[PDB]
């Protein structure tokens, strides 16, 4: 109607925004993304892109009045948690840098970010070994709880002067295709984890939800082009949905710390703590360990 | 375009246009984000009857993201129009569409029949002085500050479908005197809490800058409006005066006359009004004694 629209309808700002290796819809009221879609493959998760050189910055395309800023996060007790992981963009330093735009970031628990959420990310990358193409939609969720008088309440903290919303939960929708020629039905799974320290006791399936139920909670329709009348396999039935256990994940963490060891004694402590946990180093750990020891012997 | 092979997720925020209002829906909260309406002298006159309308789900909203009457009834909250039904007396179709729950928000009973209603009346009143009035209404969930400084957003969700109950409501009023007028435009933004508000607060207490409201709601109102141009504050070019108690209490009483189905209930409207230390004006006595003779001609 021209009369209503004479000075324009209000702008919500939810238009899809495309980047090198991810797309997102931004929530200008909460200063966080509504959803972030990415595609993962064997080649994308390989390359020389170094996360150490990347910096968090406001997304230059976002109107500043609706953008978050590093000052909102630093000192707030919450971490800047990627929705599209930086580890999924080793192939392109430009793609990785764009995952450090705050339009891709939500306030996330430190332990969750470096723990259970990281392991889900790793599981998503692992799926590329068994599937050729993997699509992932990540995003925040603000869920209700039942107050003492039975009534359901949504409560969430809001940090910084820009009032960046802290989600109560995080969701991931994983879609995997064996290949573009294959006749095998696609594998899909929806998962919802609280934005807090989880640990190693709960398996990923304990956080699995039906796609319908997640769409009702998030107010979103994921992968709308996907025809649901066809057969879509449960990813936790056709695949494993098993994250790394304590031993494997610690060995993985201790292997990464090798490359940052700036002294020989840092490097032996890494080995020390790994031995104290009775986790025997694997061949890959030793190769990097020996490589770094002679490297550090050749430096001042 | 390998990301799009199976489509980006759907937020469902596209503008939805109706006979006399438009809105953007929030599928997660099951309430509108904003509702824009245009008011004029002609629109607010006509034979469209409110009592012929029913609240119903919006037929164009996906049922999975829609609210239902079962969510509101018994929840302690009223179904509150953003675009009021009273602005569509010219068209029964327009009025019926304001009863789609896509235009509805959980609203405090007193706020809806009281302070918010009075604001709706002031907007209609503007059509005496401005030939065109645009209004954007919607809910707001704002944070409250704990004693330690932490800002917490806390709102209730009602019904099986978890319809969000907002803490505040907002209105953006834009008025133009005429399409041939050199006088500048008039604009104002207001934010009232979603609760009982008495008669002491004047509307200007709840007035906020349009910049602030936009930062709180994540919306850009009237983007095609040039803000470097001559844009006047609505409360300096107009009065921003709501009806006081006596004016409003009389307005409420004159309308309960038309619903009096018996004489004994018709004079109790007179009695309650006199016991309210308000004197019936001519319009009251006019329609009052008319309904009195009408009720003597029935039963
Ligand atoms: Mn992370
Ligand atoms: Mn109302």
Author numbering:
A (entry chain B): 59 to 358
B (entry chain A): 60 to 358
Text lifted from the article:
Human mitochondrial nuclease EXOG (hEXOG) is important for mtDNA integrity. hEXOG depletion selectively increases lesions in mtDNA, but has no effect on chromosomal DNA. Human EXOG shares sequence homology with members of ββα-Me nuclease family, which contains nonspecific endonucleases. The catalytic Core domain of hEXOG is identical to EndoG, but its C-terminal extension forms a unique Wing domain that converts the enzyme from a nonspecific endonuclease into a DNA-geometry-specific exonuclease. Conversely, in mitochondrial LP-BER, the nuclease reaction occurs before DNA synthesis: hEXOG processes the 5′-end of DNA downstream of the lesion, generating an optimal substrate for DNA synthesis catalysed by Pol γ.
Apo hEXOG is a symmetrical homodimer. Each monomer contains a Core domain that is extremely similar to that of EndoG (r.m.s.d.=0.8 Å), and a helical-bundle Wing domain that corresponds to the C-terminal extension. The N terminus of each hEXOG monomer undergoes a domain-swap where the folding of the region is identical to that in EndoG, but the involved residues are from the opposing monomer rather than from the same monomer in EndoG: the residues 58KAVLEQFGFPLT70 (hydrophobic residues are bold) of one monomer collapse on a hydrophobic patch (277GLVFFPHL284) of the opposing monomer 30 Å away. A Mg2+ is found in each active site, forming octahedron coordination with five water molecules and Nδ of N171. The nature of Mg2+ was confirmed by Mn2+ substitution and single-wavelength anomalous dispersion data. In contrast to the completely solvent exposed active site of EndoG, the active site of hEXOG is an enclosed V-shaped cleft. The cleft, measuring 32–35 Å in depth and 15 Å in width, is lined with positively charged residues from both Core and Wing domains, and is both electrostatically and dimensionally capable of accommodating dsDNA at its end.
